[PDB]
Design a protein around this motif. Structure first.
Motif, mmCIF file in Angstrom:
data_model
loop_
_atom_site.group_PDB
_atom_site.id
_atom_site.type_symbol
_atom_site.label_atom_id
_atom_site.label_comp_id
_atom_site.label_asym_id
_atom_site.label_seq_id
_atom_site.Cartn_x
_atom_site.Cartn_y
_atom_site.Cartn_z
ATOM 1 N N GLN A 189 23.804 -21.525 8.290
ATOM 2 C CA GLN A 189 24.359 -22.587 7.435
ATOM 3 C C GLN A 189 23.341 -22.998 6.354
ATOM 4 O OE1 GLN A 189 27.420 -23.184 6.714
ATOM 5 N NE2 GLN A 189 28.054 -23.914 8.747
ATOM 6 N N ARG A 190 22.057 -22.952 6.709
ATOM 7 C CA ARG A 190 20.978 -23.107 5.735
ATOM 8 C C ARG A 190 20.945 -21.935 4.771
ATOM 9 N NH1 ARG A 190 18.390 -24.883 10.161
ATOM 10 N NH2 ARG A 190 17.132 -23.005 10.609
ATOM 11 N N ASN A 191 20.943 -20.737 5.350
ATOM 12 C CA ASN A 191 20.943 -19.478 4.600
ATOM 13 C C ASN A 191 22.163 -19.342 3.646
ATOM 14 O OD1 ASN A 191 18.505 -18.091 5.224
ATOM 15 N ND2 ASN A 191 19.378 -17.171 7.093
ATOM 16 N N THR A 246 9.688 -25.619 18.346
ATOM 17 C CA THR A 246 9.130 -25.707 17.011
ATOM 18 C C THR A 246 10.217 -25.743 15.962
ATOM 19 O OG1 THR A 246 9.224 -23.422 16.277
ATOM 20 C CG2 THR A 246 7.567 -23.984 17.893
ATOM 21 N N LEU A 247 9.869 -26.186 14.762
ATOM 22 C CA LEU A 247 10.768 -26.061 13.622
ATOM 23 C C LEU A 247 11.045 -24.585 13.398
ATOM 24 C CD1 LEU A 247 9.331 -28.541 10.958
ATOM 25 C CD2 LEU A 247 11.582 -28.616 12.043
ATOM 26 N N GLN A 248 12.217 -24.291 12.826
ATOM 27 C CA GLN A 248 12.593 -22.907 12.519
ATOM 28 C C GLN A 248 11.940 -22.425 11.222
ATOM 29 O OE1 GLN A 248 14.657 -21.327 15.209
ATOM 30 N NE2 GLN A 248 13.477 -23.123 15.757
ATOM 31 N N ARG A 249 11.257 -21.286 11.305
ATOM 32 C CA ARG A 249 10.375 -20.828 10.238
ATOM 33 C C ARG A 249 11.028 -20.190 9.008
ATOM 34 N NH1 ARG A 249 7.547 -24.402 12.906
ATOM 35 N NH2 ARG A 249 5.405 -24.460 12.079
ATOM 36 N N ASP A 250 12.336 -20.048 8.991
ATOM 37 C CA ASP A 250 12.997 -19.724 7.720
ATOM 38 C C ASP A 250 12.794 -20.826 6.653
ATOM 39 O OD1 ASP A 250 15.996 -21.167 7.385
ATOM 40 O OD2 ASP A 250 14.824 -21.437 9.234
ATOM 41 N N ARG A 251 12.536 -22.056 7.099
ATOM 42 C CA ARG A 251 12.204 -23.161 6.204
ATOM 43 C C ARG A 251 10.897 -22.856 5.495
ATOM 44 N NH1 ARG A 251 15.393 -27.645 7.755
ATOM 45 N NH2 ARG A 251 16.282 -27.416 9.865
ATOM 46 N N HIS A 252 9.888 -22.548 6.290
ATOM 47 C CA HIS A 252 8.569 -22.288 5.732
ATOM 48 C C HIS A 252 8.606 -21.111 4.805
ATOM 49 C CE1 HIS A 252 8.352 -24.390 9.531
ATOM 50 N NE2 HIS A 252 7.280 -25.002 9.062
ATOM 51 N N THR A 295 15.386 -34.828 9.779
ATOM 52 C CA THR A 295 15.449 -34.233 11.113
ATOM 53 C C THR A 295 16.139 -32.875 11.134
ATOM 54 O OG1 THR A 295 15.594 -36.425 12.075
ATOM 55 N N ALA A 296 15.511 -31.906 11.807
ATOM 56 C CA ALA A 296 16.146 -30.614 12.122
ATOM 57 C C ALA A 296 17.288 -30.798 13.144
ATOM 58 C CB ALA A 296 15.099 -29.634 12.681
ATOM 59 N N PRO A 297 18.566 -30.613 12.723
ATOM 60 C CA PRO A 297 19.713 -30.943 13.591
ATOM 61 C C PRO A 297 19.638 -30.264 14.949
ATOM 62 C CG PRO A 297 20.461 -30.303 11.415
ATOM 63 C CD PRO A 297 19.009 -29.965 11.476
ATOM 64 N N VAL A 298 19.329 -28.975 14.926
ATOM 65 C CA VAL A 298 19.121 -28.195 16.128
ATOM 66 C C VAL A 298 17.764 -27.548 15.999
ATOM 67 C CG1 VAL A 298 19.906 -26.341 17.569
ATOM 68 C CG2 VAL A 298 21.544 -27.703 16.347
ATOM 69 N N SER A 299 16.965 -27.643 17.049
ATOM 70 C CA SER A 299 15.613 -27.119 17.030
ATOM 71 C C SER A 299 15.213 -26.505 18.352
ATOM 72 C CB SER A 299 14.614 -28.208 16.640
ATOM 73 O OG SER A 299 14.499 -29.188 17.651
HETATM 74 CL CL LIG Z 1 14.705 -26.207 12.576
#
Ligand SMILES: [Cl-]
Ligand SMILES: Nc1ncnc2c1ncn2[C@@H]1O[C@H](COP(=O)(O)O)[C@@H](O)[C@H]1O
Ligand SMILES: Nc1ncnc2c1ncn2[C@@H]1O[C@H](COP(=O)(O)O)[C@@H](O)[C@H]1O
Ligand SMILES: Nc1ncnc2c1ncn2[C@@H]1O[C@H](COP(=O)(O)O)[C@@H](O)[C@H]1O
Ligand SMILES: Nc1ncnc2c1ncn2[C@@H]1O[C@H](COP(=O)(O)O)[C@@H](O)[C@H]1O
Ligand SMILES: O=C([O-])C(=O)[O-]
Ligand SMILES: O=C([O-])C(=O)[O-]
Ligand SMILES: O=C([O-])C(=O)[O-]
Ligand SMILES: O=C([O-])C(=O)[O-]
Ligand SMILES: [Cl-]
Ligand SMILES: [Cl-]
Ligand SMILES: [Cl-]
Lengths: 427, 427, 427, 427
Positions: free
Chosen positions: D161-163, C212-218, C205-209
């Motif tokens: 925090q991801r970064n 949409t999911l945050q695209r730094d992941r992608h 799970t994305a803790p804070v969203s």
């Molecule tokens: Cl996210």
């Protein structure tokens, strides 16, 4: 990038020269307003004579004003008397910044254009000087058929001739000014001011504009200057390929890479070409940045300005240095004509198989009869390490031997060279 | 990318159409050789009549031959009789593949050129239909001075006119063929074959070539088609900005985003423009790939071919779909002329401050006397929420009130519109 | 990209599988709500049993609804009875689209992870199988000192081991779901729904969203999958370099490039490696696109979705195919151990000069005395074409000749191989 | 880039500091050899004490030596006595250049890590300071449902925090040294030298290496530092969006953009955020360049070095400056809590429609009966300009009015905020 900057291009991108370009724009602005009866000419003749740029002073003022045009405007104003009042009359920051930037690019483009024409000459002379220098054509890194080093240089010559054509075109797109006001509506500034400045700066006018010039101009420009860098890499990669120890068909005539004053004579490296390759990898980065600077918001946003502070000098400075360093590499480049002609026979004459086949069929022989008296002998030539001729000569293809010379002659492949050179504009 | 493909462009990049393009090249090749007395015309007239492509058969043969031109050559040959023998006579794979690829691009470029001219018309009509529609110019997302929606459309019109000019140019660079043989030396293939095919396919000849066309052509082409995509994003971002709830100055007239048949009437989204933005992010990817395809090795290497199987269709298919979807968005785009004119007064008339200042100084008043009877009242207009006029009217600037109308009139900023439209080629 | 797609990855990116993934998300959503006492379990047990996807029907409905989730929701609903009512209960489009997309990526990542582990094994076995296979180390394309093909394969093995480590990490970043509602505030949807679905789909799970999911992941994900592609290109370029006619140190054991059934035995091309290079040029394009998808507006904008329809399948499909095609190339790769050992002496033994120098100084001789009885003879070895030994043997370095063998022995350079392999995790 | 450089990072990339890093590597190299009984410790204790770098002298020597390590080696040697002899003992240029480069990166990464942790704190405090500050969530630029500025800051906090997590990881990949010799075979240099230096420089060892470190390390590193820059752009774009005149929900508290000492009070620009956006466009350029530096040839080629002379300083200098400038922007950022809460009602209460619908159905009413006594009144609220409540209150939904407050209460959407903050690690 002080290691990769020639002097003339480096000076163009100094603060001295940017402020001097703001000054000229400003002064010319006042000359324009004056013809339109807003400012007395005497006051402008005063301005031209008394106005001096001071980079240190402007930057002192900038730490409090927090704005770079205002700082400039105040600095120059301290070098003037009463005619201060007309400095920047009825203008907005970016009418100057951006008309001046296009001017400085015009200056940079004068250099790069000369670099391009020089490189084209270097390539014209190399082509003519090796017009008939037989070497192996290579596909997938593998020997295919012969070609000449002159033809390869002609290939490059025409590429650059394409690249110059482009560059000439994009210059008309980029060397363009704007003095259309806060939102490009000419609301509080007639178009004849823009017309006046841009004519005297030797640049054109953006027919419709925002607060700023439209950045599709800049992007294509970067695109272009990157294409030139990429084809420089192409050529540099060729040299790198051909200077490999197992080939030794060319050599950067610099003596660089060591071994001249040492006991390692085999260390003949193409480090200049490697250098050009790496700079190319930088110039291409700024394709991204230049393209992402196009979606500005509404009439303007300033994000493009921070990015093109770094990109525009870097890319022109890098490109100027790459063009000239590689023009020299190519000029001085040492071509081993004998190694080229030797390497033609590393495949044991197997490159002339289709010609022996043809020579048999074009002599009363059947399309398959000739194929079975070549293919098996061609195979054995590769598996063993013996010339293709010596195995052909054993079988009764004799009764001919007087002109197997013509089948095995690489000078066959020169038959259209004079036309390739004519096509390329090198006759 | 079947969701983002229009039919005409999609068909161009099918295997049917690629093989048909190989066929035409081949047949034309035989017509060329025939004029040169290598092949009887009857046999070629046979070939044109009897040769049929079969995509399934060629691909069956390709799983064993492991080579796609050979497979094709064998397939067609199964549909012919004795005239089989002349199929691919004295040619090399890439003389066909690459001359044919340029041909298919010519076809794709016919579409995109039409898309561009249509979009230019849509922009010409939008410009004229809102020539005098007052809205706020915006810099940094902030109100500066008024402009008109017509002028903004004219800004776009000229951008596209630049982008078409470019595209027209790069077409001459890319719609170019090659039939110069294994290593580009014309050694075993006269140039008049290339000349013949390319004339009949309606494309030009690469003066000097390798086994393959030189990929700086392709790269500039991609560069270009990406610039067009980037400026489509620019425009799409404008619409997105202006359709924001707090602005409501335009609206994608599609009814998309919901609320038409629901109880959420405020959900008016610019999802089409968002779509165009995202496709733009893809087209620009292939700037990298097209540019990295330039440093091929020596006469040739095939790495460019796998990359341009994906890139050339994708980029042309994407660009065709983006041009047309956004041409429609813009055509149907709903402009709220009243919301535009209302938003001009969200800054309480503070945008007309310089004009009140000027109006006082141009009336016997001192350059500073007028400044101290505007600035403090202008400040209070922003801090409180009351019109700038109502605070000016309280102080003795009266004795004038008859023509504060002229200072506060946004129709002042229309004074050069007729010239902006003349400059843009919309008079 | 049907030519560059393996079956398992290709199926993952079909519409069938995307809708099936929407279904599972939906159904699981209802199972979650049910545990929370919003929906009777019987109705959900009904839903799981009766719900069938129909790609053709959904797409029929989509041409009027103009929305793809609504279309899906209606389609499934036509396959259900009364339990229709609970389909998509208290959810927003992108709670499904995006949780489902992450799921499909999890599936794609299962494949790529296996491809990576297989390639790592292929590299482990190649390393061990050529641990001591002497070849020339090359710097700037020039002979420097010997190394072994096993060591070069170990270099690759550890690179891939880095690349797997990365990939493993980014999987935890990307295989992550979201069911936080219209604006990510959980306002009308408790977090235990997200918690439920994501646990059962085997994702986090994305803790804070946002919506949409945050695209730094992608983006990092694409970055990563592109790095793997780039190092595949590196390796492929090695093979290409080494398969060059003048080297012949390796060979793609496919027989591809022709000459097997023909009379052109020298045509042994690395076209597979060339292919991998070109696909690499595509995967890297989408670095741009993935990165430009990060600046979405506020809670969401949909521009990322059109771009990742094309990018996510393309990049995973391409990467899967490149990993496996090159795993095979490397496995089958034919290494010419004798050609390698022969090429060591193309520099005439000049690579062992420092060792003869050292051998003299480490024998009572002066640091310069030994230098003047090597350097001039080393020079003549390169200029003439005669072994470095034969010229050393003429001068009185004799009184020694019993162990010039040790100076000229390339097996000296194997002295640390066992440790290089231990370091690499191949002992 | 002297305008975009903070002092501490700028000093790291000077020539002084690069040569000093070469010195330390060299000296440490001698300490390593000494423990191994090749060099007397006294001579090395001499070296450490007497060795001084001189940037001007080294560069004088470099114009003739044409090699930068040799130049350095000669310069230092002029500051030493007899212990000269051991400088660079049994080492190759790139054992120093590259171990030293990784060291300087370690230094740069110390700064950036601190910048990241500071920005994370700024974001933690902003989050807590606006935890419950109601504003509109926005999708497609359109009002959807409320959220809080605190939640939006928490979204950013977790991104960073991801970064940071990433960045921490890539540091272990990049802060890695190499002293493996001419071709990475440890042939003439035991691994315990590398082990010694790298431990004392506080960096790790590349298990298997070439002449140079493997550039997939650098590329991922750039990738990473670019991701951080891209998400800074994301945040900066938010601020830009929210500072728009029609919104005024936040404001860069710098007073920049003018109007403080002027009569243009409405000019409140987000030029800092615009700046960060533009730098971001540069950092991302070097994704290309870093990735194209991976396919080096064989053991090494030097093309990566010219590109990373420009890229490594630029990217770290730019990123350091962007992180800190935007950390400040965010810290000082002025949030207009009242404008936020006001804008919630620009849609006339239409955002609370689903809640009125629900409130009727959850009161004995039919799923459709409630829909026809909301939807038509909701429509009229948007078409006219009157609150959604006032039209609902006219119809008999009365007999309730005591708690339409609960349906129209935006504080409903705060119900999970305490959990969103707990999830984010801000409880
Ligand atoms: Cl996210
Ligand atoms: N609307 C504007 N037009 C031109 N320059 C501006 C504007 N607003 C601010 N500036 C200044 O121009 C410079 C832009 O900074 P940079 O982003 O580093 O190029 C700064 O000194 C800004 O204060
Ligand atoms: N020298 C060459 N010229 C043209 N095509 C070739 C050559 N060598 C191989 N091919 C074939 O062309 C196709 C290239 O594959 P791809 O890399 O997927 O475009 C394959 O079918 C190859 O076998
Ligand atoms: N807020 C939203 N959330 C999810 N999907 C949406 C939203 N708004 C529109 N859509 C639909 O999602 C799809 C996006 O199209 P595309 O840009 O091609 O991915 C279209 O069918 C849109 O109508
Ligand atoms: N094999 C090598 N290892 C390290 N440095 C080298 C090598 N060959 C040349 N150099 C030098 O390193 C520098 C590289 O230049 P640049 O391409 O500008 O980084 C030049 O001074 C080269 O002479
Ligand atoms: O102050 C100005 O004129 C500006 O920023 O354009
Ligand atoms: O087989 C051929 O002719 C080729 O590959 O070009
Ligand atoms: O309709 C919806 O729920 C959406 O677009 O998210
Ligand atoms: O000279 C050297 O040692 C080098 O270039 O590595
Ligand atoms: Cl313009
Ligand atoms: Cl060409
Ligand atoms: Cl490494």
């Amino acid at each position: 990038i002080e290691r990769y900057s020639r002097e003339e291009m480096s000076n163009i991108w100094t603060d001295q020269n940017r402020y001097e370009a703001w000054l000229e724009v400003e002064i010319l602005a006042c000359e324009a307003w004056s013809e339109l009866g807003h400012i007395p000419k005497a006051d402008v003749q005063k301005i031209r004579q008394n106005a001096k740029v001071n980079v240190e002073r402007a930057q002192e003022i900038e730490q409090e004003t927090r704005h770079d045009v205002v700082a400039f405007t105040r600095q120059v104003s301290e070098t003037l008397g009463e005619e201060r009042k007309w400095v920047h009359y009825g203008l907005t920051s970016t009418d100057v910044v951006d008309t001046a930037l296009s001017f400085v690019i015009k200056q940079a483009n004068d250099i790069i254009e000369k670099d391009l024409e020089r490189f084209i000459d270097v390539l014209a002379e190399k082509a003519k000087n090796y017009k008939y220098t037989l070497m192996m054509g290579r596909t997938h890194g593998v020997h295919a058929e012969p070609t000449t080093f002159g033809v390869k240089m002609a290939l490059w010559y025409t590429e650059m001739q394409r690249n110059l054509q482009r560059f000439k075109q994009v210059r008309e797109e980029i060397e363009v000014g704007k003095m259309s006001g806060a939102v490009g509506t000419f609301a509080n500034i007639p178009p004849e001011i823009e017309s006046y400045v841009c004519k005297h700066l030797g640049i054109g006018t953006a027919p419709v504009s925002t607060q700023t010039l439209q950045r599709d101009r800049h992007a294509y420009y970067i695109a272009t200057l990157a294409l030139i860098a990429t084809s420089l890499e192409k050529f540099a990669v060729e040299i790198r390929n051909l200077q490999k120890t197992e080939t030794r068909e060319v050599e950067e005539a610099f003596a660089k890479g060591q071994k001249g004053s040492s006991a390692m004579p085999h260390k003949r490296n193409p480090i200049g070409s490697e250098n050009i390759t790496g700079i190319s990898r930088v110039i291409r980065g700024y394709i991204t940045t230049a393209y992402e600077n196009v979606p500005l918001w509404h009439e303007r946003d300033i994000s493009h300005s921070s990015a093109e502070r770094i990109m525009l000098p870097d890319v022109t400075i890098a490109l100027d240095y790459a063009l000239n360093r590689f023009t020299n590499i190519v000029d001085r480049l040492t071509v081993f004509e004998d190694n080229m002609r030797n390497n033609i026979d590393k495949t044991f004459g197997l490159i002339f198989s289709q010609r022996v086949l043809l020579a048999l069929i074009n002599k009363g022989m059947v399309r398959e009869e000739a194929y079975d008296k070549v293919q098996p002998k061609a195979m054995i030539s590769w598996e063993t390490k013996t010339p293709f001729r010596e195995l052909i000569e054993q079988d009764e293809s004799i009764t001919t031997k007087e002109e197997l010379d013509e089948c095995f002659d690489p000078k066959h492949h020169l038959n259209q060279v004079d036309t390739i050179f004519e096509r390329a504009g090198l006759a």
